[PDB]
Symmetry: C2
Subunit: 884 residues, 2 copies
């Protein structure tokens, strides 16, 4: 007798085709009915709460008196919660954000009960290759998913269950929804309807079954709970005597199905990105829907992971405090924008306007905590090493890499409180002469710098023990050339009156020929605005870089689709206006201004094809014949002590139904390329499979993408530009912005704000390298470019902290450093990194010559079995350190 396990559930997208509160109020009805069945049906086994604990919070936010009832249902085993906080899109959120989803979920779960030990990815558009290791590092032995593997090729499976092995050889139990998570939805309680139902549903599940234990998912998207499931199940037990129907849960099913597993069970390895399909519904183009959401997500994630948390971790040694609740609050606010329908940008306009508010709030909490930690650190630094009348300031490197930047610091040099007319103080500082200032180090040695600008403006202080104090102040912005600042360290300086020590050496730019060069590269800006770069260390030359391409797009927020007759417009034949904006021995910058006459939108045919829900592949709309100027302004910046070229493109988008890309021809036709993923540098082929029909192959990227051979290589890094494609000739095409007018999917939902009108700024850059070992240096500096330097002023005072201090000594090598924070109750220092290579490398951490206490998992629990702190870093290993 084959047992059939029926698990009641409801896949709840938090916000999608309706505004958030429209879904939120229907979530109240769902949970109300779930609790009613629990309290009134003694034969109701359990209800799976979609693997996300936030549903409990969203429910009790409206019905708080139900907390005790909700708690009892969880403690009785009838309401199965966890283990995640929300159901995220893996590729569109940061590596740490994926970990915090499990960490927050693990901590939120212990307010109710033991969560389900199952990774829940039912609707995730592609699954990250590091899922097995990340699951195991969070005490999750199994994972349930629905996309990425076809049940019956490297990405197929003869069984609905399988083994899933990551690049670090960590293996978990893969549970595929081979007939989707809706095969058991709406089970009939009538004879003639139940016979025809179970005759095909039992048939559909036994094609891919490897055991006598079948899985029937009793729910679907926003599905109300089947209130007569007990009657339908009891009816099924009487109509099919060979099968045994059991209202069950995932925990009992996982235990049962894995007891009678066969020996010939298959194994999938690495990413699961639907690479063996027709490529028409990968939904990868969600990486380009509403680019402003991805940019805000990148900025807030860096603010929390790489700014506020490291600084607050350092400030703990001064205060003995760590704002755990504030950080937890900021992370849950940020994670509320990480449901896959939210961060992918495939919802209605009101949903994404609401995401901007959450982005702002989480960012502001991140700035507040970073400013508190920075004040606590600088106030404890012994700045009395500087002469009197000096203006101290401290630079913080909050990353795990050697940092090389030309930074600016704004130092207040005079202050006039008003408590007379405040306007007199303004004009007083306005008419006061500004002396020559000079930067010095703690020893009094003059540091080279440049006085950029001065500003007189209103300001105020918010003391922790007194009323607000307003003032009029004068500020000097000083430019510094920081060369290879040690990771997780700080350096103190000061402004004093005196002749400024100017930068020395040859100018980086040669403006008459529109050229730049340092010791690494020689850059030439051609007439069309493209870049010709020569690698001075390898001798390789690259041409036609930074070409901009614009084509039409008549798809939706999920899928890009070029009009059939659209050839695209590029800047290859345009005539760029090139201006050298800055030129110093340490920094040079050019402004490239280009214009292309683009179609204002799609022609009038697209609207009727959208309203009629015509499939995008059958759409005949072309680009409009009415034109409108489209201006592209790009800044190209080069500094003396780095091989990275930095790009900053500005547009005021008034064009609809189009996609803008920037092109980097590498001249290398290779089998594979490399992209930044989740705790992984994933290798991907450039040749689509035999079943692939999409003329494009959009792919997800985090921080960079790379194409290289045995001699040379090009690394393109970005900020919030998560969609790329490697063309046939080896050209790296990064998508800047993609504008559509409808949601897509199951109906017609107009989304005009998905046209992304208004001003935008895209930050990206390139880095050349030679032998394949030199990739990882460009990978680290790609991570470092996303992390800004932290500078803050402070007065003269004594203190227990030295003016220059290295907080963490990191093992040099191909390692990505992603987290520095402190554990919840213990306040132990937590550091997390991961191996960039497939090789065992030495990795030893030290905090002021003190070794780490032990290695932990991502939940900051000690590893079992224990790994030695000085043990080599295994290939693709995610390692977390604990310092007491």
């Amino acid at each position: 007798k084959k047992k059939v396990y029926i698990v009641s559930h409801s896949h709840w997208d938090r916000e999608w085709y309706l505004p958030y509160e429209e879904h939120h109020m229907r979530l109240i009805e769902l949970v109300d009915n779930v609790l009613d069945l629990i309290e009134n049906d003694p034969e109701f086994n359990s209800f799976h709460l979609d693997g996300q604990t936030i549903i409990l919070d969203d429910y009790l936010q409206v019905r708080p008196e139900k907390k005790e009832a909700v708690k009892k249902a969880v403690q009785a085993g009838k309401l199965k919660i966890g283990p995640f906080y929300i159901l995220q899109d893996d590729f569109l959120i940061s590596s740490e954000s994926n970990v915090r989803n499990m960490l927050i979920g693990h901590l939120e779960s212990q307010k109710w009960g033991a969560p389900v030990q199952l990774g829940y990815f039912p609707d995730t558009f592609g699954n990250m290759g590091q899922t097995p290791q990340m699951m195991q590092l969070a005490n999750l032995p199994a994972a349930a998913f629905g996309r990425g593997v076809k049940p019956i090729s490297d990405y197929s499976s003869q069984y609905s269950e399988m083994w899933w092995e990551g690049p670090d050889q960590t293996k978990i139990f893969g549970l595929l929804f081979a007939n989707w998570y809706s095969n058991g939805n709406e089970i009939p309680s009538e004879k003639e309807a139940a016979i025809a139902f179970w005759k095909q549903k039992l048939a559909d599940v036994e094609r891919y079954a490897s055991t006598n234990h079948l899985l029937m998912m009793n729910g679907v998207d926003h599905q109300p709970v089947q209130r007569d499931i007990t009657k339908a199940i009891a009816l099924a037990n009487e109509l099919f005597p060979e099968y045994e129907f059991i209202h069950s849960n995932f925990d009992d099913y996982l235990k049962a199905v894995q007891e009678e597993l066969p020996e010939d069970l298959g194994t999938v390895t690495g990413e699961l990105t639907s690479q063996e399909t027709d490529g028409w519904y990968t939904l990868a183009n969600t990486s380009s829907a509403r680019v402003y959401l991805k940019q805000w997500n990148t900025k807030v994630q860096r603010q929390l992971e790489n700014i506020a948390e490291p600084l607050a971790a350092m400030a703990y040694e001064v205060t003995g405090d760590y704002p755990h609740d504030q950080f937890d609050y900021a992370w849950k606010t940020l994670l509320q924008n990480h449901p896959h329908d939210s961060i992918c940008g495939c919802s209605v306009d009101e949903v994404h306007r609401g995401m901007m508010t959450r982005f702002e709030n989480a960012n502001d909490v991140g700035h507040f905590l970073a400013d508190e930690a920075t004040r606590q650190l600088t106030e404890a630094i012994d700045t009395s090493v500087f002469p009197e009348k000096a203006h101290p300031f401290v630079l913080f490197n909050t990353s795990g890499y050697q940092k090389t930047e030309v930074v600016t610091v704004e130092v207040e040099i005079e202050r006039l409180p008003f408590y007379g007319k405040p306007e007199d103080l303004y004009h007083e500082l306005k008419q006061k002469a500004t002396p020559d200032y000079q930067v010095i180090d703690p020893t009094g040695k003059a540091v080279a710098s440049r006085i950029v600008k001065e500003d007189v403006r209103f300001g105020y202080d918010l003391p922790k023990d007194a009323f607000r104090q307003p003032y009029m102040a004068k500020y000097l912005t000083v430019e510094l050339s920081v060369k290879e600042m040690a990771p997780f360290s700080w350096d103190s300086f000061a402004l004093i009156q005196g002749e400024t020590k100017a930068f020395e050496g040859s100018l980086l730019a040669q403006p008459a020929t529109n050229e730049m060069e340092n010791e690494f590269i020689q850059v030439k800006i051609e007439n069309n605005g493209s870049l010709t770069i020569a690698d001075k260390k390898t001798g390789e030359t690259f041409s036609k870089l930074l070409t901009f391409e614009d084509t039409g797009d008549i798809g939706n927020e999920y899928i890009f689709f070029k009009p059939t007759e659209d050839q695209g417009i590029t800047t290859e034949n345009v005539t760029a206006e090139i201006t050298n904006k800055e030129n110093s021995p340490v920094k040079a910058s050019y402004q490239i201004k280009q214009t292309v006459m683009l179609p204002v939108a799609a022609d009038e045919r697209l609207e009727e094809e959208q309203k009629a829900v015509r499939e995008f592949r059958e759409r005949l709309a072309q680009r409009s014949t009415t034109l409108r100027p489209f201006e592209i302004t790009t800044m190209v910046t080069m500094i003396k002590e780095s091989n990275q070229l930095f790009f900053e493109t500005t547009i005021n988008n008034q064009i609809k139904d189009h996609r803008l890309r920037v092109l980097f021809p590498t001249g290398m036709v290779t089998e594979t390329h490399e992209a930044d993923s989740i705790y992984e540098v994933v290798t991907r082929p450039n040749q689509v499979s035999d079943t692939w029909e999409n003329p494009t192959n959009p792919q997800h990227q985090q921080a960079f993408v790379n194409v290289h051979d045995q001699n040379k290589g090009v690394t393109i890094f970005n900020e919030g530009l998560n969609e790329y494609e490697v063309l046939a000739d080896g050209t790296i095409a990064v998508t800047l912005i993609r504008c559509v007018g409808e949601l897509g999917d199951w109906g017609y939902f107009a989304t005009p704000e998905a046209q992304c009108q208004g001003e935008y700024t895209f930050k990206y850059g390139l880095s050349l390298h030679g032998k394949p070992e030199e990739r990882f240096a460009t990978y680290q500096q790609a991570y470092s470019a996303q992390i800004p330097f932290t500078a803050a002023t402070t007065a003269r005072h004594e203190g227990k902290l030295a003016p220059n201090h290295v907080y963490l000594t990191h093992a040099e090598g191909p390692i990505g450093w992603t987290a520095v924070k402190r554990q919840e109750q213990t306040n132990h220092l937590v550091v997390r990194g991961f191996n960039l290579t497939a090789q065992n490398i030495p990795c030893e951490l030290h905090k002021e010559t003190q070794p780490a206490t032990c290695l932990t998992n991502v939940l900051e629990e000690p590893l079992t079995p224990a790994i030695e702190v000085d043990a080599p870093l295994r290939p693709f290993e995610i390692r977390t350190w604990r310092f007491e």
Copy 2:
């Protein structure tokens, strides 16, 4: 020996010059330190939590594991909470929103312990006239305030910092004035020398206006951290000054002590406290026009909850036995979070107000969901089998307490092709190509109702059933126009759409397009080439000219204050060639489009930015309007229906202009001593003659739904939706401010607010109503309330039901009454109805529900009055009466 009562507090603006979370993270630090003092310092008496309970909620959402500590702090009487939910602006939120603030503040305070029984208005920009009655109707016998009254010593001036406050209904409460502001006791020195100079000054300031030997020192200020050494400083004061007894105390103990020794010569203030006897420069009344989109959304969401969702849900309880109390509490708290004075006044930074829009969207969507749930539940219970087969029935609800007259539009689905039938694009074009039969409207009897088919539409649609998956389909919709005449209050009428010859409206066309004229049985409208209106009251014989004139001037002030540049003399549409086009014309409804293009300065000149950065006082600002001009088009839709004297206006602009204010003018033609305006449960009488101390060349006043000017023979009423700033000019011209654009926050520093320039598309809804005898003015007020409450139309299928096709849910005592609430009590589910008298006379007011009288009259907290008032007792002047039906 006098007693010095030191009350520690912190006036906490939830969001102001910083983004919300920047203030919020500092709120966590404050409450952490207050709990530190409460749990450790044995001499720390208590801490007054700014009169708002939302501080407890905002603290626990970041630190939930501190809830037991907060409970113990409140249970110990050391954390003084309530009685409000938030500290609101009085005039800029609806009448019910003021009551919901007290109702939720009470219910929340009871969850922790009990509220401080003191009305807390420390920084409210003007106080509503009905404050004493509203305080008394919430079990609050006293109110502490800071603005509106001037202390003297030895009309709106008091010799003492204690006074009696009598409302228009003669309800009288005890008034506690912060005569030396709520910061006189801030940062008490804990050192000998500093304490002497401090108290020698502070004691003399408080004694200037003390009517008793009990003195109030407010130990706190805006966003002030709690004074950690307050215990030490108080003991030092008792040591240094033997003639005084310094006590760390609280408002409960102070109020009991000061009112026990109150002298008989105590002064009494009556009505509004709007700083009438000041110089008029710092009323901050111009906040009512700052960021008008906030006021428009607030009006929309408030009507959606008070006058749509709650009345429909109260009726839907009859068929379901359920009422979504938790959802309404969630929607109201979300809306009240936009009601702190710095929020709704529009005097914060850009990040704050973009966050308010999210709250408005969320609260509005909950009100829509709850209204659609009640609407579906009611229509599912209506017996629609009375209509013939194949008919498409629909139901019209009047969710207001007034006789409603309106030309209504109803969209009815006539066909539906589900997606499982075939390919979606095939179904779309199949319905598009299918011919449309002529349809006819019928009542349950079968008698044809006059109508007109407006338009047809074929689009995608879906259903979200409560027991199955989503249901997508392609549908065809017909838009039918009905002429509803004096529909009964709180009732519903059922109609149906059958195939047949449509019954057209009969009578003469309301509009005469050859001369740009409209007229019915009440008014005769001429639209001049000027674009202004010349109206003739056909019942009273009066004429009014130059109506609907637009005026734009510069504004170099801030979000608080309007200030015209010294050389600006204004720009008007009085000398402009308008483009007039008749859009609709029928026997029941006609509308005209008026297009006017005027050249406006793009902004102020470059001198304004320097005067803002230097924080120069606005009166000393030399900036003028820019000489660079830019086109500015004004499009107004003037609408008239057959069965109403209301002339509706809809002005739309694409505001690309900065540093200016646009108003619409209505010359009444009569110079009176006083005018009237809609306030909070009150039609307040305001003077046109400006006081002697007043120096502001303008007199901006707050309005809710309307403003009126009348004499003994004629009158003009101007109603609006979210246009809350008005001014009655010296020649009787009513000027309603449409939009006011500034670039800085103002107040204590320089805070650039470019989104306060209100750039983009805007639509202003307002109207005109004429009357004759002064008693006729109250009917225009009711219809002004009724214009803000749209009809609720809903389609349903044919089915038997337990509700009648036509039914009156509530019968109202006809007369000069405003009806503001129909909802149900949280636990008892009793039907709650609230109205108020518009006049100063005792009028009859008997309310019935299905011929059954009310059980008892209650306060605004929905509890029986003590002592009770008979349900058939006459409505007292300016009384706010609340009914309860068990």
